Amino acid sequence: ALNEGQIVTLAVDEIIETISAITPMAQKAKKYTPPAASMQRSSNTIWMPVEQESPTQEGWDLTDKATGLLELNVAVNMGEPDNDFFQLRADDLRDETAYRRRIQSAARKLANNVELKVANMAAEMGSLVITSPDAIGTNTADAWNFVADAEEIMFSRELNRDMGTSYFFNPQDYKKAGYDLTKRDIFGRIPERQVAGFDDVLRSPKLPVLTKSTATGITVSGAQSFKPVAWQLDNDGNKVNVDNRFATVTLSATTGMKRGDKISFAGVKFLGQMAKNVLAQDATFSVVRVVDGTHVEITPKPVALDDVSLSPEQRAYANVNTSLADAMAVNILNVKDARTNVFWADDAIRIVSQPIPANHELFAGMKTTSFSIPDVGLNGIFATQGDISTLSGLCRIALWYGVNATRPEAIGVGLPGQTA
Amino acid sequence: ALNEGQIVTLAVDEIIETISAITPMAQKAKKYTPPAASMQRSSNTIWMPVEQESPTQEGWDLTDKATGLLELNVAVNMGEPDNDFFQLRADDLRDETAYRRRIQSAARKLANNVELKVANMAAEMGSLVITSPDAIGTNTADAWNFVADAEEIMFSRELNRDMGTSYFFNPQDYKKAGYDLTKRDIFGRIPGFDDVLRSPKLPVLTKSTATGITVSGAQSFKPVAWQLDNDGNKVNVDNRFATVTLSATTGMKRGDKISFAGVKFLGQMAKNVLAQDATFSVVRVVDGTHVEITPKPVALDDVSLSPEQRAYANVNTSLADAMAVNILNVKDARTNVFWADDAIRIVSQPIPANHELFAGMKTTSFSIPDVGLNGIFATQGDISTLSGLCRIALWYGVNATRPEAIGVGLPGQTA
Amino acid sequence: TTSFSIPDVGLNGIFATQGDISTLSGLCRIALWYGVNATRPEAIGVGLPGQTA
Amino acid sequence: RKLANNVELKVANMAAEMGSLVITSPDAIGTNTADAWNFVADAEEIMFSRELNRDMGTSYFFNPQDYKKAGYDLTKRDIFGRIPEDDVLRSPKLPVLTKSTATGITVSGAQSFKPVAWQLDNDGNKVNVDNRFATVTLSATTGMKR
Amino acid sequence: ALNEGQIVTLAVDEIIETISAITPMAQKAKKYTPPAASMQRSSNTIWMPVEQE
Amino acid sequence: DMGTSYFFNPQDYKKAGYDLTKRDIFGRIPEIQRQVAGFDDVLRSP
Amino acid sequence: ANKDAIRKQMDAAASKGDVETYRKLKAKLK
Amino acid sequence: ANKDAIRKQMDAAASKGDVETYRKLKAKLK
Amino acid sequence: ANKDAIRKQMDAAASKGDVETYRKLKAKLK
């Protein structure tokens, strides 16, 4: 009974409403819309700026304010679209309700995969790692207070000066921590400000399990020092921004190391971002990739305060008391398999999306309509085509988006049970 | 005696005329405009498509033959604009001629920067190296025909997407070759082909002291469409550049031309072995044993790579365990560059400006049509110096896409 | 499908487009149907320089 | 451009692997009368002596190396040497004919070939016989390729 | 931003002109049109006569 | 990044191998100048 | 009623295939 | 001059879908 | 005569700040 226009409108409406309602994790991420709109299938690397607040100056005459801080950009790439390709059988097109249900199932699949991507990003890119042999529980005698520890480590580092922190719990630890699901939805949101605050604790069942690192005795090789640099020359001789998030270090060996591991050099201590005061907490670094059998990359760039070569504008970007020494130990943190809990600041994860470049009505074989989800910030396409093999139509919903873990130092992952 | 509108008009006109005259090389390279139109984010790493190469695909029935395409890309970074920020005094603004002279002095510097950018890139990452022990001249016996050799190496390689190749001589070699230059313009243009012209800004490629260096191991390079970055997304791979491990990268610089022994070119389109040895240009010395050579050597006789990857082969055979590097630039010589239609691209976007939004400075946007450059012209009043600040900004990125199509002619390489 | 012909070469072909949702793009096909025959191979010559042996 | 590649590659390979008027010389192609080989002159002479050219002229195709060595100006010519508005042209798709390693090859027996107009197929109908190719029995065919 | 007719016309024109431009050998080979032109996909074995002696 | 003006005495101008064909008595061209483009001008003066 | 007229206009909009006005009328419904 | 009018005729022929007229007009333009 | 009129027109265009008309008139003048 449905005609093509009703098919398109109902499907787009269902996708938008379902994806907006399902994902809480993507809502917490700060959506970023590139100024550039591209007609190319291969998305250009978006270099979006990362802003650290300048200290306010008081007085009538500000001619001498100067102090142009270092401008650093982070790179986000958009992968191939995440799509759901399926057949629209005659049963699904019998009336409005069946079509709504099928499109809702497709949107549930896409939204679940978006949440999975965000959760994997946070777990495998989170720098602030907090561990102890205990397990999360209500009693204070022999259990965690994950919210309290995360709040304390955030306040000590002064990363979230004004805005609130988003805490995410896997269902088991969410139940253990004492949070009740009564009068609550699946994710822990209450069925119902934006300027400030809005500190929320939610339960996300998409948090992965962090496999333990089967690596012991790895020592730093050489003396590595890292300085945040805004520009570098590419092979063409032009100037390209430097992703100052990742710093590659040289180790004795990388055997038993993978993407998800966490490390914490023995002699390196964290610093308050706004005060540069040495903190008692050991500095925690998260690996992103293992380049070779000798080199490895880590999420927070260790920039030592006690660097003579460091410029004052570069010294503003400091999170380490002293650089890597000659024979420091990696001191791997995640020693036991455990489901992770992730927390991050206001702008510690960004969702980047731009409309899919496609030309409509040129090829009469398929009908493609572009839709956007403003609440989540995902741009997508909805396409249908008649297939003679199944004597029905083929439908495809493709979402194009890129998750970027900007400011990985503000993403915290807390995994309990690291007994030995 | 100049009002503001006349100031803007004369400045834009003089900039356009001066840039379009003293820039012969930037006009020969293809002009690219990206749809992105970014705003003061160093633009982006604009990923530019490259021509597709596919297998035969013969037969009436082709079920799933359209899925295996590679779709390689190359990247250009626009970077930050080239400026000329100076003061306009009452001396310059008294008369139209003086103001035009000052604006011409600024625009000439900007155009020279463009010209050196293009010339240095063409000379330092041109792959089709042609060297002869004899100097360029007209005599068939003891001299060297650079134009004929370059045209033949382009034709055999089948790298000339047919529009014609541009030949650039340094003025010395241009005079050595039998070119009239009286009926032509200053650079040799008309107001073996007719694209031969001379450019003063052609650099000199210094010697290479590397000797007796060999490949460290058996490396095979294959075209990769994309790779996972540290965020887990999919980022394209610049397939121009290949990192090859050598025994020792001593004496190697950004401009050296190398050609591994036992390795010959292939027709890019026919895939037949040529007589000429495959010449590569090193673009970076990464370590004491690693360099980056600007054409990626893809071997026809490499079973590891798929037919869709074999469609991109440009090399007779892969690098063996201990093959000889065979440095080519053995004597100092001023370079002659030549390239095909699409071998260098100047990408430019209009500079993002909010005109008349902020009162105090007058900003106007000018575009040179002959050279794919976009600019902005800004004038502000400075009470401290009782004069007027003036800024001319050119935003462009010169890209050496398809480095295999850029050639360097090195005469006199006796030993 | 559009059928064209190249008069200078003597090839006959067809140009076809269709839209595919498995690629979200329009498939395009160009065909050339021709057969090269070497009639009178005695009249075809091959020149082989530098046969030093 | 890929389709034109296929057409030209097919024509060039067929001409190289089916051409039988083979002319060879120990020297290399060039303009030096004393020590170089005049490919065009030898080709014209062998086609004229053999009388296989209907008096409309032949077509000579060089590879770019030998075209450069043969001293053709190319300035007043198209990219292929066609004199745009002796027809000697150059093509970049001319294959390299690999050497043959057969040494001790002799005819196996006395064989005589005759032009046959037709033959009977399996169904009993008459079908023409392609009178280009003749099957020769040899002592051995090791090292022999198309 | 190209309509269907424009797509077809531009594609066919480009194919014809570039193939007729970059085919030097194929233009020196004689063009033969089979006398029997029928709508069939099976490839027939065309027998062209050679000069009678 | 502009031209340089070279002035020879007539004898060293002759010895350096400079011709006066299609040039006036001083080596100039009889008719954005060449200097702006970056091309040197060689002349002779007594 | 207002709801019936809104639903009729929603059906008319969905017939033509316009999603923007469909979403706006749905928002007015809520 | 008339080149801009024959270019409009070429564009109209291309939009219609007639390759032969487009090619004839393109030959006329050159 | 004609050159003087073109010069007056391009001077007026430059005074108005219209670069495009000034460039077109400069092309016409020479």
Q: Residue A5 and residue G22: Cβ atoms within 8 Å?
A: no
Q: From the CB of residue A323, how many other CB atoms can be counted at a distance below 10 Å?
A: 22
State which residue of chain B sits closest to A405, comparing Cα positions. B231
Tokens of B265: 């070119």
Residue C18 in contact with partner chain A when CB distance is under 8 A: yes
Query: DSSP 3-state helix, strand, coil percentages of chain C (rounded to 5)?
Result: 5, 55, 40
Residues H9-13: contacts with CB under 8 Å, at least 24 apart: H13/E9
- Phi, psi at A365, each rounded to 5°: -65, -40
Q: Which CATH class is domain B205-333+402-410?
A: mainly beta
Please report all neighbours of F, defined by 3+ CB atom pairs within 8 A. Answer: B
Q: Is the pair F, A in contact (3+ CB pairs within 8 Å)? A: no
Residue B60 in contact with partner chain E when CB distance is under 8 A: yes
Contact partners, residue A41, CB within 8 Å, separation at least 6 = A357, B71
* Alpha carbon distance D91, E25 (integer Å): 8
Question: Nearest to residue A391, comparing CAs of A59, A63, A91?
Answer: A91
Q: Give the best residue of E19, E38, E40, E45 to mutate against chain C (max C CB count within 10 A).
A: E19
Rounded to the nearest angstrom, the minimum Cα separation between B377 and chain I is: 12
Q: Residue F39 and residue B182: Cβ atoms within 8 Å?
A: no
Question: Nearest to residue B399, comparing CAs of B74, B50, B116?
Answer: B74
Question: Nearest to residue B52, comparing CAs of A111, D101, D5?
Answer: D5
Q: From the CB of residue B336, how many other CB atoms can be counted at a distance below 10 Å?
A: 30
Helix (H/G/I), strand (E/B), else coil: D44: helix
F12 secondary structure, DSSP code = H
Nearest to D92 among B148, B149, B155 (CB): B155
Nearest to D11 among E15, E29, E50 (CB): E29
D36 secondary structure, DSSP code = S
Q: Residue B22 and residue F38: Cβ atoms within 8 Å?
A: yes
Residue C23 in contact with partner chain A when CB distance is under 8 A: no
Helix (H/G/I), strand (E/B), else coil: D117: coil
Question: Nearest to residue A399, comparing CAs of A118, A135, A151, A134?
Answer: A118
Residue D22 in contact with partner chain C when CB distance is under 8 A: yes
Q: Is the pair C, G in contact (3+ CB pairs within 8 Å)? A: no
Q: In B, which residues are within 8 Å of A241 by CB distance?
A: 42
Q: In E, which residues are within 8 Å of H8 by CB distance?
A: none
Residue C53 in contact with partner chain A when CB distance is under 8 A: no
Rounded to the nearest angstrom, the minimum Cα separation between E50 and chain B is: 30
Single-letter amino acid, residue A199: D
Q: Residue B13 and residue I19: Cβ atoms within 8 Å?
A: yes
State which residue of chain I sits closest to B10, comparing Cα positions. I14
**Do B372 and B346 meet the contact criterion of CB atoms below 8 Å apart?**
yes
Residues A365-370: contacts with CB under 8 Å, at least 24 apart: A365/C18, A365/C19, A365/C20, A366/C19, A366/C20, A366/C21, A367/A4, A367/A8, A368/C21, A368/C24, A369/A8, A369/A12, A369/G17, A369/G19
Q: Angle of helix B4-21 relative to helix I2-16, nearest 10 degrees?
A: 110
- Phi, psi at B379, each rounded to 5°: -135, 130
DSSP string, A129-150: EE--SSEE-S-SSSEE-HHHHH
Please report all neighbours of I, defined by 3+ CB atom pairs within 8 A. Answer: B
Question: Nearest to residue A128, comparing CAs of A106, A151, A102, A94?
Answer: A151
Residue A361 in contact with partner chain E when CB distance is under 8 A: no
State which residue of chain G sits closest to A16, comparing Cα positions. G23
What Å distances lie between residue B361 and B4, B366, B381, B386, B390, CA to CA?
11, 16, 7, 15, 10
Question: Nearest to residue A239, comparing CAs of A400, A404, A47?
Answer: A47
State which residue of chain C sits closest to E5, comparing Cα positions. C2
Which residues are D128's β-sheet partners? Answer: D118
**Experimental technique behind these coordinates:** cryo-EM
Termini Cα distance of chain A:
64
Query: DSSP 3-state helix, strand, coil percentages of chain D (rounded to 5)?
Result: 25, 15, 60
Question: Nearest to residue A401, comparing CAs of A120, A9, A104, A46?
Answer: A46
* Alpha carbon distance B145, B153 (integer Å): 12
* Alpha carbon distance B395, B79 (integer Å): 8
Please state whether beta strands B242-245 and B234-236 pair in parallel, antiparallel, or not at all (unpaired): unpaired
**Do A173 and A341 meet the contact criterion of CB atoms below 8 Å apart?**
yes
Residue B32 in contact with partner chain A when CB distance is under 8 A: no
Q: Residue B47 and residue A41: Cβ atoms within 8 Å?
A: no
Q: Is B360 left (phi over 0), alpha (psi -120 to 50) or beta?
A: left
Tokens of A97: 């309700």
**Do A114 and A26 meet the contact criterion of CB atoms below 8 Å apart?**
yes
What Å distances lie between residue D120 and A331, D117, E45, H9, CA to CA?
88, 11, 16, 60
Which stretches of A23-145 are DSSP H helices? 25-28, 96-125
* Alpha carbon distance A23, A16 (integer Å): 12
Q: Residue A5 and residue G15: Cβ atoms within 8 Å?
A: yes
- In the sheet with B290-293, reading across from the earlier edge strand, the strands are B242-245, B290-293, B280-285, B257-258
Residue positions counted in chain E: 53
Contact partners, residue B65, CB within 8 Å, separation at least 6 = B57
Q: From the CB of residue B340, how many other CB atoms can be counted at a distance below 10 Å?
A: 23
Nearest to C36 among D11, D16, D29 (CB): D11
Helix (H/G/I), strand (E/B), else coil: D6: helix
Residue B385 in contact with partner chain I when CB distance is under 8 A: no
Helix (H/G/I), strand (E/B), else coil: A271: strand
Residue D1 in contact with partner chain B when CB distance is under 8 A: yes
Tokens of A173: 């630890």
Q: In A, which residues are within 8 Å of C21 by CB distance?
A: 85, 366, 368, 383-385, 394, 396
Torsion, Cα of D123, D126, D129, D135 (10° steps): 50
DSSP string, A195-240: SSB--EEEE-TT--EEPPP---S-BB-S-------SEEE-TTS-EE
Neighbouring C-alpha atoms within 13 Å toward the C-beta of I8 = 4
Rounded to the nearest angstrom, the minimum Cα separation between E29 and chain D is: 9
Burial class for B309, CB neighbours closer than 10 Å (0-12, 13-18, 19+): buried
Q: Residue E13 and residue H26: Cβ atoms within 8 Å?
A: yes
Which residues are B410's β-sheet partners? Answer: B131
Residue B8 in contact with partner chain I when CB distance is under 8 A: yes
> Quick one: how far is CA B35 from the chain centroid?
21
State which residue of chain E sits closest to B59, comparing Cα positions. E41
Residue D16 in contact with partner chain C when CB distance is under 8 A: yes
**Do B283 and B127 meet the contact criterion of CB atoms below 8 Å apart?**
no
**Do B115 and B20 meet the contact criterion of CB atoms below 8 Å apart?**
no
Question: Nearest to residue A48, comparing CAs of A353, A311, A383?
Answer: A353
Q: In F, which residues are within 8 Å of B187 by CB distance?
A: 37
Q: Residue B200 and residue F34: Cβ atoms within 8 Å?
A: no
* Alpha carbon distance B221, B224 (integer Å): 9
Q: To what resolution in angstroms was this structure determined?
A: 2.6
- In the sheet with B361-368, reading across from the earlier edge strand, the strands are B82-88, B387-395, B373-382, B361-368
**Do B214 and B245 meet the contact criterion of CB atoms below 8 Å apart?**
no
Single-letter amino acid, residue B206: T
Query: Residue written as tokens 């004689």?
Result: E30
**Do B189 and B24 meet the contact criterion of CB atoms below 8 Å apart?**
yes
Rounded to the nearest angstrom, the minimum Cα separation between C9 and chain E is: 5
Q: In C, which residues are within 8 Å of B67 by CB distance?
A: 23
Residue E4 in contact with partner chain A when CB distance is under 8 A: yes
* Alpha carbon distance D78, D72 (integer Å): 12
**Do B128 and B405 meet the contact criterion of CB atoms below 8 Å apart?**
yes
* Alpha carbon distance B149, B139 (integer Å): 15
Rounded to the nearest angstrom, the minimum Cα separation between D28 and chain E is: 23
Question: Nearest to residue A93, comparing CAs of A408, A384, A407, A405?
Answer: A384
According to the 3-state scheme, what is the secondary structure of chain B? CCCHHHHHHHHHHHHHHHHHHCCHHHHHCEEECCCCCCCCCCCCEEEEECCCCCCCCCCCCCCCCCCCCCCCEEEEECCCCEEEEEEECHHHHCCHHHHHHHHHHHHHHHHHHHHHHHHHHHHHCCCEEEEECCCECCCCCCCECHHHHHHHHHHHHCCCCCCCCEEEECHHHHHHCCCCCCCCCCCCCCCCCCCEEECCCCCEECCCCCCCCEECCCCCCCCCCEEECCCCCEEECECCCEEEEECCCCCCCCCCEECCCCCEEECCCCCCEEEEECCEEEEEECCCCEEEECCCCCECCCCCCCHHHHCCCCECCCCCCCCECCECCCCCEECEEEECCCCCEEECCCCCCCCCCCCCEEEEEEEECCCCEEEEEEEEEECCCCEEEEEEEEECEEECCCHHHEEEEEECCCC
Q: In H, which residues are within 8 Å of E9 by CB distance?
A: 13-14, 17-19, 22
Neighbouring C-alpha atoms within 13 Å toward the C-beta of A244 = 23
Q: In H, which residues are within 8 Å of E3 by CB distance?
A: 15
Torsion, Cα of A100, A102, A108, A109 (10° steps): -160
CATH number belonging to domain A210-338+407-415: 2.40.30.240
Tokens of B133: 């022990």
Residue B247 in contact with partner chain D when CB distance is under 8 A: no
* Alpha carbon distance A125, B180 (integer Å): 66
* Alpha carbon distance A10, A222 (integer Å): 62
* Alpha carbon distance A348, A406 (integer Å): 5
Q: Is the pair F, B in contact (3+ CB pairs within 8 Å)? A: yes
State which residue of chain B sits closest to E19, comparing Cα positions. B162
**Do B43 and A73 meet the contact criterion of CB atoms below 8 Å apart?**
no
Nearest to E18 among D1, D8, D128 (CB): D1
Helix (H/G/I), strand (E/B), else coil: A349: coil
* Alpha carbon distance D129, D84 (integer Å): 42
Nearest to C15 among E8, E23, E27 (CB): E8
Tokens of B381: 């009043």
> Quick one: how far is CA C27 from the chain centroid?
20
Q: Which of residues 72-131 of D touch E (CB under 8 A)?
A: 80, 82, 87, 89, 91, 93, 128, 131
- Phi, psi at B98, each rounded to 5°: -65, -45
Instruction: Measure the CA angle with vertex A188, ends A186 and A189; round to 5°.
Output: 105
Q: Residue B152 and residue D1: Cβ atoms within 8 Å?
A: no
* Alpha carbon distance B47, E42 (integer Å): 45
Torsion, Cα of B140, B146, B149, B152 (10° steps): -120
Residue B67 in contact with partner chain C when CB distance is under 8 A: yes
Tokens of B60: 């009436």
- Phi, psi at B234, each rounded to 5°: -110, 120
Helix (H/G/I), strand (E/B), else coil: A364: coil
Contact partners, residue B163, CB within 8 Å, separation at least 6 = B340, B341
